[PDB]
Symmetry: D2
Subunit: 238 residues, 4 copies
């Protein structure tokens, strides 16, 4: 009986917390990583954006854990004669969280080891194979306190096509499910694993996105969020 | 303009149209196919169950088509020294529709040929390979006027495990998406394809389920619905719905 | 456990149970009482309209009672050199209920005496003073098994102005609240009282409307429903509902 | 198609902006004005509390105006041998708004004249007659840029009884409606007037409450919010 819900088809900076390169465009697109005046994404970009209100994920008195779901449309595009990098992620982080390392660490980590004090749960849409931890194919991944996903599924990434994502968390089964569909291509992908939010996250978090572009010439992308809905519910006992 | 929503964690016959073998158990479960007096599914069973109010899927005056979503939990169980058959489906059908042939035709069809006047959109959960039309592995299928799915994905069926399904239809993209998760196994499956509702279905439909048991000894299953939510809008927020 | 919600900005007969004179106009309006071929309401008319699916209001196993809310826009208009009669009501009634006596009994009652087997909870919008039971001024009333309201408030009725109604029932406090606003006049009215649903209504009900025209020359009105939303929950967020 | 919704049966300070004397108690009650360790409210108190995310009320490009609704339960109680003062209000204010004068000005105004730059829309629950502007009976009032309500209705205030309020705004009719019911007493009250949000408010606002206690001995109250739900919807055009 704590409940929060929002849904935006267009964005504005007034109710968002924007970090580093993240901007809202004059078309109300949330552009997580830098794009120049020619409309070309640039290298070594990092941006993160969050809803301005913190969200209660669990409660240390009752032991209750929230159920949540989020949907969003994103557009990742690539200039001709480049390949994509590095990707974007929906995230749950500590209130006051600041950006970490760029590139393949997605602004979320400092290295590729597990860190039980990272307090990070993310669903990544990873467009670049990082030899020290990634599966080879592009992938949707569930990340808990590491850039090395606890679970992944192959994602047949296609540049410039709008991708519609749904992520759900059921606190009774502890199941986190992420799916992506490309409506114009009629293709769909799904990954699922259990996550113990209560052991990983603080009681309150900020929710939103992080994204990076490649550090090396020829590996680059736009990372645009086009719409976002979020809902959470945390039982209080009446 | 029009919105409809319902959600049941337990079922009752009062607001449901039950057909053939479909019963509401005394524990509030929707048993679509017959279980005997001991707790065993029986062969050749067919049952269909629908919400008692018709849903408007599209409008010929405005041309608008509904978006909808549905979620349900189901339990398919199989007796020992037996295999599963034949599966269950969520369906959209014309008002007043009657059960068709049982078995692998799921109470929805007379034959395995394409029938352009069947007016059927269904998402099937197929537990038995029918050599004449099915893919070999167990599958989730999107059925449009035919038992031969327009698209399927592999489903790693496991007996007696609760399965959670989400089906969504986006009228702006004409995309129908169906996913199933087994929460205790942490496995997940998704299939997607476009369906033009306006040329397949009448303007008003009934929504619900159909299921069958196998007709041949050793091929049988329970087809139980444990909970069901539906929403439609005709002129969806999926984060809100899934919650 | 159980939740039901619907919202219509335009009506269609397909999902409605229409009774006596109640028609859906070709412009999607729910005309509860008869209008002639020219656009004039006629005397002695009675019409009732219900959502086609039964709603569960309470459960005898658990003891739980539903909370619900409903909102609707209505237009009561009156011809020149005439006064209004007899009004319209939102009702909860047993499944299969038939119209009762017309006129000031609103199609809900046979007489003006308390009937403990009428199984009726209604919110009336009363346009005609019935000397034997009504307060003198026009009123909103909460009717429980009787046409003599358990509670009323003064309603400054104005002909042909759209009226927006909100009715809520909180099962935890047993409180039923009804309010009406005239947006173009900026006037508002509210009445509240407790109703014990569990001892008045069956476990399953039909929700909808009833209306009547006056039986005596010069007392007549249109009773039109322009839009309708309903929600119930059986184990409400009113900020969400009203929006 | 911008939509925001929240509903809390218990409060926590983490997602609220609290000003001056406002606190959240260990029972998760939002206590807008000061209460001492004996549970007695004190004089000359002022507190305000807001949801931490700003809410978009209108849009200067499309001219669209939001529809909203809010419900809340409040408890105003009075020690024996005092009378109540001064009351509480649900408010829509500029982002960054700071408290104004205490007592009968409810933390919202500096005097009792109209001020077209106050950017204030409030629904007041006024428990003390202020001779220079109030109607004599206690009242629910609609306030637009003045402590002198544009419209009022008599409120039969009863100390210590939970009051359930619903406030709705329809941007198509511009009608603001406020109602209060006391469920244990079965009584109910309603006020309605039109308000042009676009001429009064900035495009984005903070939503929440303000309350004060009397400045003069014998005029005092608790001003506790017990639950709160809010929803708004602003058309974007798809
Ligand atoms: C080792 C590796 O993964 N190299 C790829 C490189 O990755 C960058 C940086 O993004 C990574 O976070 C760190 C991991 O320590 O390594 C490098 O510094 O990104 C390139 C594209 O920009 C790839 O071509 C390399 O394969
Ligand atoms: C040909 C075939 O599919 N045989 C399988 C059989 O199918 C039944 C029935 O279920 C089908 O609907 C019709 C299709 O015309 O054929 C048969 O009568 O079901 C058996 C289990 O019940 C399978 O083992 C057969 O392979
Ligand atoms: C006695 C009375 O109420 N007379 C009014 C009359 O009422 C009709 C009918 O509407 C009532 O239901 C029954 C109650 O027994 O009495 C009459 O038959 O309606 C007239 C307008 O139609 C009023 O002017 C009478 O005052
Ligand atoms: C003049 C008046 O209203 N006096 C009442 C007094 O009001 C305070 C303060 O609360 C008001 O905002 C200002 C208006 O200029 O006047 C006074 O300073 O509050 C008393 C209770 O504390 C009442 O008894 C007075 O009637
Ligand atoms: C966001 O809103 C404010 C108006 O409050 C405006 O100043 C700003 O330019 C807006 N940005 C966009 C992209 O709409
Ligand atoms: C269905 O509802 C009726 C009450 O109207 C009741 O007799 C029956 O027990 C209900 N079924 C279940 C499974 O609860
Ligand atoms: C009711 O629905 C049917 C389509 O099934 C249509 O023929 C009729 O025009 C509809 N009524 C209105 C008022 O639109
Ligand atoms: C609010 O939440 C935080 C836990 O994140 C806690 O420190 C604080 O004491 C809480 N207050 C109440 C009243 O629950
Ligand atoms: Ca990578
Ligand atoms: Ca088959
Ligand atoms: Ca009357
Ligand atoms: Ca005052
Ligand atoms: Mn990866
Ligand atoms: Mn099949
Ligand atoms: Mn009456
Ligand atoms: Mn006042």
């Amino acid at each position: 009986a704590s409940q929060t819900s929002f849904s935006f088809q267009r964005f504005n900076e007034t109710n968002l917390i924007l970090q580093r390169d993240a901007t809202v465009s004059s078309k109300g697109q949330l552009r997580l990583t830098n794009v120049n005046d020619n409309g070309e994404p640039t290298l070594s970009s990092l941006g993160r954006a969050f809803y301005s209100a913190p969200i209660q994920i669990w409660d240390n008195t009752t032991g209750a854990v929230a159920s949540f779901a989020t949907s969003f449309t994103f557009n990742i595009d690539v200039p001709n004669n480049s390949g994509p990098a590095d990707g974007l992620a929906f995230v749950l982080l500590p209130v006051g969280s600041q950006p970490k390392d760029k590139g393949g660490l997605l602004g979320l980590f400092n290295n590729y080891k597990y860190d039980s004090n990272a307090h990070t749960v993310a669903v990544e849409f990873d467009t670049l194979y990082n030899v020290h931890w990634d599966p080879k194919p592009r992938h949707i991944g569930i990340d808990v306190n590491s850039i090395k996903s606890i679970k992944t599924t192959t994602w047949d990434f296609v540049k410039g096509e709008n991708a519609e994502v749904l992520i759900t968390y059921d606190s009774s089964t502890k199941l986190l499910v992420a799916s992506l569909v490309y409506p114009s291509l009629k293709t769909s992908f799904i990954v699922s694993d259990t996550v113990d939010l209560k052991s990983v996250l603080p009681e309150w978090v900020i929710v939103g996105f992080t994204a990076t572009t490649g550090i090396t010439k020829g590996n680059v992308e736009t990372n645009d969020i086009l719409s976002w809905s979020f809902a959470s519910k945390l039982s209080d006992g009446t």
